[PDB]
Amino acid sequence: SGFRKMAFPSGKVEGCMVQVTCGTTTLNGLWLDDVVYCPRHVICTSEDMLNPNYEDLLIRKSNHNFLVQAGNVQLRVIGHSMQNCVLKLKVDTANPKTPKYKFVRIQPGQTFSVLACYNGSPSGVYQCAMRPNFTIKGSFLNGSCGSVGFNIDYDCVSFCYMHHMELPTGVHAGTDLEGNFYGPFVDRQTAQAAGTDTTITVNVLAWLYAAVINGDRWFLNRFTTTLNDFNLVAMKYNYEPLTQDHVDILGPLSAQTGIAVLDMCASLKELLQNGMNGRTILGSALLEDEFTPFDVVRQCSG
Amino acid sequence: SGFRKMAFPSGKVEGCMVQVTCGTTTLNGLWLDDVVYCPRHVICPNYEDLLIRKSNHNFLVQAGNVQLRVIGHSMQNCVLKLKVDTANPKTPKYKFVRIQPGQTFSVLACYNGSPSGVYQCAMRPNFTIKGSFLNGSCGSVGFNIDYDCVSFCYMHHMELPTGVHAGTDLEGNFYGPFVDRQTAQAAGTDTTITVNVLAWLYAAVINGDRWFLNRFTTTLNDFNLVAMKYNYEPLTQDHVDILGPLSAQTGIAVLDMCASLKELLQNGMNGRTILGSALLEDEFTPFDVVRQCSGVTF
Numbered sequence: 227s228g229f230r231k232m233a234f235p236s237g238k239v240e241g242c243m244v245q246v247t248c249g250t251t252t253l254n255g256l257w258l259d260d261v262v263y264c265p266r267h268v269i270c271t272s273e274d275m276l277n278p279n280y281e282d283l284l285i286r287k288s289n290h291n292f293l294v295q296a297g298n299v300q301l302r303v304i305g306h307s308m309q310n311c312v313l314k315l316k317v318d319t320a321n322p323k324t325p326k327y328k329f330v331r332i333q334p335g336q337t338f339s340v341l342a343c344y345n346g347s348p349s350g351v352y353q354c355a356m357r358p359n360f361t362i363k364g365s366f367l368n369g370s371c372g373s374v375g376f377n378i379d380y381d382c383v384s385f386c387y388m389h390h391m392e393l394p395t396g397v398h399a400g401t402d403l404e405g406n407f408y409g410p411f412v413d414r415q416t417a418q419a420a421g422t423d424t425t426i427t428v429n430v431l432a433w434l435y436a437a438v439i440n441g442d443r444w445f446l447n448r449f450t451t452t453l454n455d456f457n458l459v460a461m462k463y464n465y466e467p468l469t470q471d472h473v474d475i476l477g478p479l480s481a482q483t484g485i486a487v488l489d490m491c492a493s494l495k496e497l498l499q500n501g502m503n504g505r506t507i508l509g510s511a512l513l514e515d516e517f518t519p520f521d522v523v524r525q526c527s528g
Numbered sequence: 529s530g531f532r533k534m535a536f537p538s539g540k541v542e543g544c545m546v547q548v549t550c551g552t553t554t555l556n557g558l559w560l561d562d563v564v565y566c567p568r569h570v571i572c573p574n575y576e577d578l579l580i581r582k583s584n585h586n587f588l589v590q591a592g593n594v595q596l597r598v599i600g601h602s603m604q605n606c607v608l609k610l611k612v613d614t615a616n617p618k619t620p621k622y623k624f625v626r627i628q629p630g631q632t633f634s635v636l637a638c639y640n641g642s643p644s645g646v647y648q649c650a651m652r653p654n655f656t657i658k659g660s661f662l663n664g665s666c667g668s669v670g671f672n673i674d675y676d677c678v679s680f681c682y683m684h685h686m687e688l689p690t691g692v693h694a695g696t697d698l699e700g701n702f703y704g705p706f707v708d709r710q711t712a713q714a715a716g717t718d719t720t721i722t723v724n725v726l727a728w729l730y731a732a733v734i735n736g737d738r739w740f741l742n743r744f745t746t747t748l749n750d751f752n753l754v755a756m757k758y759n760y761e762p763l764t765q766d767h768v769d770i771l772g773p774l775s776a777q778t779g780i781a782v783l784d785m786c787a788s789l790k791e792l793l794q795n796g797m798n799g800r801t802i803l804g805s806a807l808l809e810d811e812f813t814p815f816d817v818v819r820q821c822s823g824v825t826f
């Protein structure tokens with residue numbers, strides 16, 4: 227019993243964190259095999275950030291301009307190349323702690339663990355979701371750039387996020403491990419802003435199924451809804467539209483609890499209308515949207 | 529910016545998790561140097577009588593895909609100590625520490641000696657933890673990290689009828705009035721950790737949330753008369769001293785923040801949230817707030 231915001235054990239990722247320094251800028255890098263991956267903005271100064279020409283800044287650098295530190299050991303850079311917004315530094319030593327891994331690009335609504343690092347040293351681990359507006363609500367200070375997001379389903383680490391910047395509202399933007407930003411963000415100090423955020427509907431439904439599995443049913447009602455009527459109501463509360471894919475994805479949780487997806491949708495419509503009236507659901511007074519259907523199945527009893 | 533329920537990096541603890549099997553019971557063990565620590569209930573009660581009937585070879589200890597051989601066994605309170613023939617080469621610098629209610633720690637939840645997740649929690653004033661554990665999680669441990677030293681503070685033993693959890697320190701002493709046996713047991717009435725809510729209000733101010741601030745202040749005695757009414761733990765002068773640094777950083781005196789908390793208890797949030805929460809959060813200590821708002825590494 228119980229339901230917590232649970233992160234994957236971070237050990238496999240801790241053994242990959244290194245510190246990267248170029249001139250006066252120091253940030254984090256991910257050391258996998260003989261390559262260190264880091265945000266390309268490590269080659270910029272604060273002035274460069276308004277309109278940096280990364281190709282022009284990079285051509286002026288040599289291998290020995292990049293200082294890479296793994297623990298108390300300096301790694302030697304023997305090559306460098308840029309792939310989108312990431313810099314790939316070829317080093318002379320393969321990481322003996324390299325786990326089994328993949329690079330995966332995730333969709334909004336998907337969750338992952340973040341190992342927040344400063345100076346190549348891990349400071350903490352927490353759970354995050356890629357918001358519908360492609361930002362993440364992380365906890366990052368200056369020097370956190372290069373910290374990564376990942377999932378570890380079955381001994382393989384799937385790296386899905388690398389931290390690059392904080393937007394004016396305090397939210398965070400970054401790339402996949404191939405250097406493609408999530409959302410319309412750019413690694414430039416331009417007037418950029420997160421778009422209007424929405425609630426991840428399929429995740430709230432998943433969390434309501436977790437509450438039923440753990441023994442709470444107070445929010446259920448005798449009603450049902452069509453998918454279209456549910457979407458017309460939910461969009462009025464800034465909830466993402468629920469698609470037939472989301473309904474199919476919720477099938478297993480529906481079968482385990484005996485509550486049809488559209489019946490759980492009617493319960494959500496009523497919760498949006500009434501609020502909780504002094505009650506809680508899994509220790510929360512707000513509707514939680516950072517647990518996916520897969521996360522609920524992973525954590526909850528069968 | 530941002531404020532999350534953050535756990536310590538778990539790698540140093542992952543390298544200590546092993547699977548322990550005795551008969552039909554399988555649970556988790558903590559392998560440090562040449563000893564595996566696990567709940568004594570793995571033997572299945574008169575524990576001295578049950579233990580004397582077991583031999584070293586009755587305990588199967590598995591570290592990854594390697595079987596460790598047990599060469600000795602002894603009991604210390606509610607913890608079984610299995611002497612093994614191999615010292616753990618991954619043994620980190622460590623201590624066994626007993627924590628107080630209100631203190632937080634990270635839990636590395638394990639099944640079959642394999643870590644499945646990490647989360648942060650607090651020892652409640654009623655000595656239970658609101659964890660997330662299924663059958664087979666027994667022997668999972670709670671810890672903190674200070675620089676490079678792992679301080680082990682909790683070992684999971686059981687789930688109470690309300691779904692909350694009970695366990696021991698690593699010397700086998702229970703937190704709370706619990707016993708390791710199938711008998712009628714219940715969590716006592718819980719209270720809210722006042723010093724932790726105040727710490728979280730300071731974290732909200734640091735992150736730019738100030739709507740709850742007011743021009744008022746209070747005395748410790750008047751605030752404590754309010755805390756008692758709302759099932760909040762009493763605030764002591766030690767708590768006030770501990771909050772000093774956060775008070776100096778934000779410019780809001782501790783009794784000034786106490787007046788803000790009193791108004792929140794008496795009037796609610798009125799449709800507003802604090803750090804994305806509609807409830808007053810009590811599972812962040814003053815040190816957790818300072819550490820997350822400064823970026824301390826391990």
Ligand SMILES: O=C(Nc1cncc2ccccc12)[C@@H]1CN(S(=O)(=O)N2CCC2)Cc2ccc(Cl)cc21
Nearest residue numbers: 267275366367368370371390391392413414415529
């Ligand atoms: O965002 C960036 N860094 C950070 C990242 N995360 C969490 C931070 C917290 C606190 C300070 C920095 C943080 C950097 C620096 N900033 S900054 O204007 O100095 N800024 C303060 C809020 C962001 C411009 C910038 C522009 C583009 C790029 Cl790719 C990186 C960056």
Ligand SMILES: O=C(Nc1cncc2ccccc12)[C@@H]1CN(S(=O)(=O)N2CCC2)Cc2ccc(Cl)cc21
Nearest residue numbers: 227569661662663665666685686687707708709710
């Ligand atoms: O509590 C224990 N295990 C668990 C521990 N944590 C999370 C569980 C979730 C689900 C099932 C077990 C779980 C065990 C078994 N139970 S039990 O009656 O089978 N029970 C169901 C709720 C607890 C009695 C018992 C008595 C004493 C001792 Cl020390 C351990 C234990």
Ligand SMILES: [Cl-]
Nearest residue numbers: 331332333336
């Ligand atoms: Cl995805």
Ligand SMILES: [Cl-]
Nearest residue numbers: 573574575576
């Ligand atoms: Cl006994």
